Design an enzyme around this catalytic site. Structure first.
Site, mmCIF file in Angstrom:
data_model
loop_
_atom_site.group_PDB
_atom_site.id
_atom_site.type_symbol
_atom_site.label_atom_id
_atom_site.label_comp_id
_atom_site.label_asym_id
_atom_site.label_seq_id
_atom_site.Cartn_x
_atom_site.Cartn_y
_atom_site.Cartn_z
ATOM 1 N N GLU A 141 0.808 -1.222 0.000
ATOM 2 C CA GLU A 141 0.000 0.000 0.000
ATOM 3 C C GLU A 141 0.841 1.272 0.000
ATOM 4 O O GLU A 141 0.652 2.151 0.842
ATOM 5 C CB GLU A 141 -0.978 0.006 1.183
ATOM 6 C CG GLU A 141 -1.773 -1.290 1.346
ATOM 7 C CD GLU A 141 -2.944 -1.147 2.302
ATOM 8 O OE1 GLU A 141 -2.943 -1.818 3.356
ATOM 9 O OE2 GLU A 141 -3.856 -0.346 2.011
ATOM 10 N N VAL A 142 1.774 1.362 -0.943
ATOM 11 C CA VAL A 142 2.618 2.540 -1.066
ATOM 12 C C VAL A 142 1.943 3.557 -1.977
ATOM 13 O O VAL A 142 1.699 3.285 -3.154
ATOM 14 C CB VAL A 142 4.012 2.187 -1.624
ATOM 15 C CG1 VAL A 142 4.882 3.433 -1.710
ATOM 16 C CG2 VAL A 142 4.677 1.132 -0.757
#
Ligand SMILES: *[C@@H]1O[C@H](CO)[C@@H](O[C@@H]2O[C@H](CO)[C@@H](O[C@@H]3O[C@H](CO)[C@@H](O)[C@H](O)[C@@H]3O)[C@H](O)[C@H]2NC(C)=O)[C@H](O)[C@H]1NC(C)=O
Ligand SMILES: *[C@@H]1O[C@H](CO)[C@@H](O[C@@H]2O[C@H](CO)[C@@H](O[C@@H]3O[C@H](CO)[C@@H](O)[C@H](O)[C@@H]3O)[C@H](O)[C@H]2NC(C)=O)[C@H](O)[C@H]1NC(C)=O
Ligand SMILES: *[C@H]1O[C@H](CO)[C@@H](O[C@@H]2O[C@H](CO)[C@@H](O[C@@H]3O[C@H](CO)[C@@H](O)[C@H](O)[C@@H]3O)[C@H](O)[C@H]2NC(C)=O)[C@H](O)[C@H]1NC(C)=O
Ligand SMILES: *[C@@H]1O[C@H](CO)[C@@H](O)[C@H](O)[C@H]1NC(C)=O
Lengths: 480, 492
Positions: B287-288
């Site tokens: 989840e960057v």
């Protein structure tokens, strides 16, 4: 302030007041209708002196206006209103009855906190508060899973912190019969999971007196004629045999049934001191009755044809009279009302289906019968996320009807059916999701701000945890 | 029995056991002998669980020597055979870790009749795990977890034969790990610098405690995403987000355009690799968000120097590549989330990918195909997110999952080394951890250990519910599968 539920009127002032553990006292006012002879208040004073602690206010005077009702059991018409005044050097808690004093003591304990240096403090204020609805309860299922007495008593403590006043005890059902009957000892001896999984008379007596000391009513429910597969273990020929080998619901054709119920509910009338008795009458399947030759004969001699809703109505009315004969009220699920059965004046109806339930509320109130809501608050149906918001958003008085029909709405309940709930997960799954219902049933209609609700509920949840209630978190964070 | 053994040949021929006069003894032949820390404590721990012709003894013989002081690894063999009959009562395991499994299996086979008499049936077993990596994830960031809760979880992981503890120590809301190379991380990131903390003493206790249970400790200090709690303490580490012209307070992921960042990671992960003995480390990379990086002008300038352009997928690659080299130089392997693989990040052939997403970008079964066909090893966790609760018995969903149900060759499917169940702490802490964990996590436990053919839901329910009551007897606060009861109901 971390108040929950939010009181009707709160007037906070930035003036600080400090308290002292071994110097703070809670006693009766010189002109009160209740004195040191009142066991209920005496217990409540010592109990809350532990919650509060464990420019100086030295004493909290509790003044009961009207006839205290100190030694009585709470009923639907009880007065829980109260007024609080936090000032130096004497704080004043005044209420009409004793029930308001309990609610007031809870609110008062939620106002005391410790500052940065651990100094017990409380902003001086003036509070006037009263419950929006009079029937605010929690349903527990001790049949699908047996619940040790300890957790039921803890549930009562949790209900006190959240200002609930009714414990809908769904004691028996299909899976098991844990209730030990004095008149019919065979019901529990053969119908319970095991002999250790049984509620003896004393266990029940302990639950009731523990609830009374906190203003909680114990509403018993012995569902009939459905949900009774365990009843037919210690009582022969009570259930309808299914031909065409299992059994069905209670047989409403034999006179043995009604003679049994009369002596059974006569015991219940003396065991449970509450006026109302829930009879159930829901999810009743006509499959088995329709396949019984003996019963089909009873349909002719009465002329009910093939509409078993009349056979359903015939049974429930018979039971209603029994309850009316012994000077007791009655509560019943919505199926019975929908089955076109005749209810006595004062009979309560509990709506529980999702499909157009506001319309059900309309129909019941239109017929002039009091109503209770539980449809949108089936807490046993869990889901991922902050579903406490779904329960908090619910507005009960949102249905067609006159202003006179709205008075018939007396409250609601949050149900926790135990198909997948026992002592291992009851507390965490129940709280603080039920707290959302508590505020919605006590606080004003215009109290609906999410940010504030979330803010106060997180801090109130931590308070329950410190008081020994394992309530689960709403989101990421921490207590202490 | 839970999980169900590969080869279990039962009978109805029974033997009488004696609570007090029952002892575990080594065989003179064995490699592990008195002094074997793991087994010495195991014999003690198990006799407390059970008793806290006839049979008085149980012979334990390990063929492979490799001590009892060295920790378990991905390559450790857990093969064992349980032989109980009229002539002998022998537990023969290949390694020390197989013996632990054997003892657990032995503990569940011991039963008592209505008389109360202890018994043990005539049994012949030849068991082994289907996958070598059977893990369980705990999120100690969103909600802090007291050391006692973690040790308790490890006790139950042992019962279910789970051998990997995926410790997700830190994340956005909290940094409870106490670092000695950067003391400011814990002092200004944790909820409370004293009560909600993990000391060096706490960490070494977890590791050794897990070691005695034959459990690996996979540590995860997620980067560069999920790092909001890193901000305070180490200034300049996070990326200051922009509105357009000037910065607007909010911080994003780790800033990969500063020299300061890489010298911090090099020093910090040196400690991590020193504190955690396991060969592998989880580096995160999930989840960057590229939103904060793009808004930043100073970072926009950085990509024009290195010649990356408009894609932040290779900007992220630059960070991870460097990060992998740093961790690789300490002789450490690494596990990473599926984003790293999905974002075409330059990746070492020995890297392991952990599939967690369900639909986006592609189905999780299609993910395993891509990852394995690409040549990498894979962990499965997508359908085993315990934190995602639902009404009813969703344990049946976890149990029915088939990890190798995808398009591929025999050796291609062999790259799947197992999976992990995930208990993210957004809505879970010390108050509801145990009940929500077990016995739902046991469904994943069996699917990772037992054979492909063991899939009957009816046969699963019977044993799982029987195991659920047994958990309660051992003091485990496990929730019910459905309507029913245990004779010894939970009450503490
Ligand atoms: C270990 O051996 C024991 C006995 O040596 C096995 O216990 C047996 O368990 C079965 C299965 O529950 C019992 O049979 C049951 O009998 C009732 C009627 O009495 C029947 O209605 C049930 O359907 C069920 O079949 C049996 O009582 C019991 N002992 C005997 C004498 O057979 C046990 O199965 C063995 N453990 C395993 C699973 O390997
Ligand atoms: C622990 O158990 C595993 C599986 O039970 C053992 O691995 C397996 O060992 C068997 C027999 O040694 C191998 O079977 C052989 O396969 C080859 C083809 O590769 C065939 O030519 C032989 O006739 C024989 O059938 C099998 O390949 C191998 N792999 C698995 C996972 O089944 C392992 O040896 C045990 N560990 C130890 C050290 O005892
Ligand atoms: C009793 O409760 C009142 C009401 O909650 C509290 O008054 C609060 O006092 C604090 C401390 O000064 C105020 O915080 C201040 O906020 C301003 C920005 O508006 C900030 O610049 C200051 O540094 C300071 O933090 C706060 O506004 C005020 N009310 C609220 C909403 O918390 C107080 O805790 C109690 N009474 C007193 C005055 O001791
Ligand atoms: C960062 O700058 C320092 C100071 O010269 C240097 O030692 C180090 O190699 C640099 N790191 C890089 C190349 O990112």
């Amino acid at each position: 302030p971390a108040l929950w539920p939010l009181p009707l009127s709160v007037k906070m002032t930035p003036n600080l007041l400090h308290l002292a553990p071994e110097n703070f006292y809670i006693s009766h006012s010189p002109n009160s209708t209740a004195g040191p002879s009142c066991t209920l208040l005496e217990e409540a004073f010592r109990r809350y002196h532990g919650y509060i602690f464990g420019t100086q206010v030295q004493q909290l005077l509790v003044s009961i206006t009207l006839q205290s009702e100190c030694d009585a059991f709470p009923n639907i018409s009880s007065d829980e209103s109260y007024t609080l005044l936090v000032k130096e050097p004497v704080a004043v808690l005044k209420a009409n009855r004793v029930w308001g004093a309990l609610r007031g003591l809870e609110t008062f304990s939620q106002l005391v906190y410790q500052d940065s240096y651990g100094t017990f403090t409380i902003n001086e204020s003036t509070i006037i508060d009263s419950p929006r609805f009079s029937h605010r309860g929690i349903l527990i299922d001790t049949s699908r899973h047996y619940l040790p007495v300890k957790i039921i008593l803890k549930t009562l403590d949790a209900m006190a912190f959240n200002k609930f006043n009714v414990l809908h005890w769904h004691i028996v059902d299909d899976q098991s019969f844990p209730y030990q009957s004095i008149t019919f000892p065979e019901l529990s001896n053969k119908g319970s999971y095991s002999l250790s999984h049984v509620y003896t008379p004393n266990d029940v007596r302990m639950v009731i007196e523990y609830a009374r000391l906190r203003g909680i009513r114990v509403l018993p429910e012995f569902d009939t004629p459905g949900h009774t597969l365990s009843w037919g273990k210690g009582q022969k020929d009570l259930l309808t045999p299914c031909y065409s080998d299992s059994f069905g619901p209670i047989n409403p054709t034999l006179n043995t049934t009604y003679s049994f119920l009369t002596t059974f509910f006569k015991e219940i009338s003396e065991v449970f001191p509450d006026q109302f008795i829930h009879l159930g009458g829901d999810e009743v399947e006509f499959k088995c009755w329709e396949s019984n030759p003996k019963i089909q004969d009873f349909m002719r001699q009465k002329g009910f044809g093939t509409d078993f809703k009349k056979l359903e109505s015939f049974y429930i009315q018979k039971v209603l009279d029994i309850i009316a004969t012994i000077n007791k009220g009655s509560i019943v699920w919505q199926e019975v009302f929908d089955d076109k059965a005749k209810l006595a004046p004062g009979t309560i109806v509990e709506v529980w289906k999702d499909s157009a339930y506001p319309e059900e509320l309309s129909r019941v109130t239109a017929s002039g019968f009091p109503v209770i809501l539980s449809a949108p608050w089936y807490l046993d149906l869990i889901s991922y996320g902050q579903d406490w918001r779904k329960y908090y958003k619910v507005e009960p008085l949102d249905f067609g009807g006159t202003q006179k029909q709205k008075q018939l709405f007396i409250g609601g309940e949050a149900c926790l059916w135990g198909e997948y709930v026992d002592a291992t997960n009851l507390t965490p799954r129940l709280w603080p999701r039920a707290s959302a219902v508590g505020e919605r049933l006590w606080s004003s209609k215009d109290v609906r701000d999410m940010d504030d609700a979330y803010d106060r509920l997180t801090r109130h949840r931590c308070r329950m945890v410190e008081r020994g209630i394992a309530a689960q978190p709403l989101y990421a964070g921490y207590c202490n | 029995l839970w999980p169900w053994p590969q080869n279990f040949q039962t009978s109805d021929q029974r033997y009488v056991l004696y609570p007090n006069n029952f002892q575990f003894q080594y065989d003179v032949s064995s490699a592990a002998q008195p002094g074997c820390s793991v087994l010495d404590e195991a014999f003690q721990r198990y006799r407390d669980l059970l008793f806290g012709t006839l049979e008085k003894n149980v012979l334990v013989v390990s063929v492979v020597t490799p001590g009892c002081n060295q920790l378990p690894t991905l390559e450790s063999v857990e093969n064992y055979t349980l032989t109980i009959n009229d002539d002998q009562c022998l537990l023969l395991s290949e390694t020390v870790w197989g013996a632990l499994r054997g003892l657990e299996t032995f503990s569940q086979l011991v039963w008592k009749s209505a008389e109360g008499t202890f018994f043990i049936n005539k049994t012949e077993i030849e068991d082994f795990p289907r996958f070598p990596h059977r893990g369980l994830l705990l999120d100690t960031s969103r909600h802090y977890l007291p050391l006692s809760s973690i040790l308790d979880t490890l006790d139950v992981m042992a019962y279910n034969k789970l051998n990997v503890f995926h410790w997700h120590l830190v994340d956005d809301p909290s940094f409870p790990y106490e670092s000695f190379t950067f003391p400011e991380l814990m002092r200004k990131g944790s909820y409370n610098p004293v009560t909600h903390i993990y000391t060096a003493q706490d960490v070494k206790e977890v590791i050794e405690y897990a070691r005695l249970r034959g459990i690996r400790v996979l540590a995860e200090f997620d980067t560069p995403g999920h790092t909001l709690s890193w901000g305070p303490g180490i200034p300049g580490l996070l990326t200051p987000c922009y509105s357009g012209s000037e910065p607007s307070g909010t911080f994003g992921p780790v800033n990969p355009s500063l020299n300061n960042t890489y010298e911090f990671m090099s020093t910090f992960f040196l400690e991590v690799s020193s504190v955690f003995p396991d060969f592998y480390l989880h580096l995160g990379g999930d989840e960057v968000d590229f939103t904060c990086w793009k808004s930043n002008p100073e970072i926009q300038d950085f990509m024009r120097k290195k010649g990356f352009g408009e894609d932040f997928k290779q900007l992220e690659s630059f960070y991870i590549q460097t990060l992998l080299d740093i961790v690789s130089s300490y002789g450490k392997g690494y596990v990473v989330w599926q984003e790293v693989f999905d974002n075409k990040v330059k990746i070492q052939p020995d890297t392991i990918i952990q599939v967690w997403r369900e639909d986006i970008p592609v189905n999780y079964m299609k993910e395993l195909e891509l990852v394995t066909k690409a040549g990498f090893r894979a962990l499965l966790s997508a359908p085993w997110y315990l934190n995602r609760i639902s009404y009813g018995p969703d344990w049946k969903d976890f149990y029915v999952v088939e990890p190798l149900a995808f398009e591929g060759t025999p050796e291609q499917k062999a790259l799947v080394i197992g999976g992990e169940a995930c208990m993210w702490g957004e809505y879970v802490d010390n108050t509801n951890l145990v009940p929500r964990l077990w016995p739902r996590a046991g469904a994943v436990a069996e699917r990772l250990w037992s054979n492909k053919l063991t899939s009957d839901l009816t046969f699963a329910y019977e044993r799982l519910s029987h195991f659920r009551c047994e958990l309660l007897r051992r003091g485990v606060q496990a929730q019910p599968l459905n309507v029913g009861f245990c004779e010894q109901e939970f009450e503490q």
